[PDB]
Amino acid sequence: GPHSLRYFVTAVSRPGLGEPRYMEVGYVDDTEFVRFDSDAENPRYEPRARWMEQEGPEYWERETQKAKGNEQSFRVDLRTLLGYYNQSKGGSHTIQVISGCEVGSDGRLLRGYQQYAYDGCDYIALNEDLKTWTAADMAALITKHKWEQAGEAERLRAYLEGTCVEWLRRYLKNGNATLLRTDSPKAHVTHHSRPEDKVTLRCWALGFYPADITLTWQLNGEELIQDMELVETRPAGDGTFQKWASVVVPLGKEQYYTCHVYHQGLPEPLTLRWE
Amino acid sequence: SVFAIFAAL
Amino acid sequence: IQKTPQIQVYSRHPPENGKPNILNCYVTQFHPPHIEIQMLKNGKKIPKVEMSDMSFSKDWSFYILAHTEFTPTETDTYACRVKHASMAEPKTVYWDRDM
Ligand code: NI
Ligand code: NI
Ligand code: NI
Fold this sequence. Notes:
Chain C: Residues 5-94 form the Ig-like C1-type domain. Chain C: Keywords: Disulfide bond, Immunity, Immunoglobulin domain, MHC I, Secreted, Signal. Chain C: This is Beta-2-microglobulin. Chain A is of the alpha+beta class and 275 residues long. Chain A has helices spanning 57-85, 138-150, 152-179; strands spanning 3-12, 21-28, 31-37, 46-47, 94-103, 109-118, 121-126, 133-135, 186-194, 198-208, 214-219, 222-223, 229-230, 234-235, 241-250, 257-262, 270-272. Chain A is globular and about 70 Å long. Chain C is mostly beta strands. In chain C, 0% of the residues lie in helices and 46% in strands. Chain C has strands at residues 6-11, 21-30, 36-41, 44-45, 54-56, 62-70, 78-83, 91-94. In chain C, the strands form two sheets. In chain C, strands 1-2-6-5 form a four-stranded antiparallel beta sheet, with no helix packed on it. In chain C, strands 4-3-7-8 form a four-stranded antiparallel beta sheet, with no helix packed on it. Chains in contact: A-B, A-C. At the A-C interface, strand 1, strand 2, strand 5 and strand 14 of A face strand 1, strand 2 and strand 5 of C. Bound molecules: nickel (II) ion (3 copies). One nickel (II) ion (NI) binds at residues 50, 67 of chain C.
């Protein structure tokens, strides 16, 4: 299929409380495999899947070292960004980063990821050319000039086009067992009666992987856009997902409404009504 | 493998 | 840049009285990351609940999944109490098994 290697990085200042909290979480096909948390009892990179215990202590010692170095660097960045925005020393602030590569079947780079946010707002991003940056405001222009003078695009390219791809292929090989598997949803409807003789029809999808899924409610062909209450896909916490979609219908009329469930583990969608 | 020594802002 | 955290309280597996199971509290769509999350049995703090599995999404909003072991019964109530800066008061969401 088309597969991704993404690192999600966070630094949060806590001045007067301690030093910043620093985190790196790695994903493969939007599934978490490694985690570093500076607030863990003994902070080191740790396996967060089964198939990563296949790596020896040198992998972990080396990724820890990198995380301990990135940590010190994000502390300086937090102080630098106070200056650029002329913010007081006393408040809590966040830098987040999405760093990653996605390849298709070719096994060559489709899309390079390096995007930053400050206190939850876009700050700077590598463009799709893997050469230029886009700044979200005045402060980010300062970072832009600094990064051009230093040739930071290139050093990041080398990793993105090189080391990122090569560790993606390796991680897929080691983990394909679980990554490219397909747990098909188990789906059912619940009828909860509601004031002024109406009924909530709730279409459940449970125990599915991957997360990607569509739920639809309809009455003879036509898909109910407006009326549909739709929760965010949630993890069961065993690597499978849950979702539900609901509609309000008049009593006596429940039987005319149909739910569809589309997922990669189904050649044709599931169809379900009440009872 | 994460990128290591992310560039200084 | 304050965001109102969405709270879902649900069981890993479909619930059976007497049968061990996992209760999940999924808090999403919040910033800044600082948040306090307690899980409650009959309105009493359950001890040793992992408030560690935290990350964020493409939109930069944080999300945490807390979980604890539990054996459901016919009378016991479960809920998740969440405290965020963006909220004047804690928000308590109850486990609803018939949902
Ligand atoms: Ni029924
Ligand atoms: Ni607190
Ligand atoms: Ni546990």
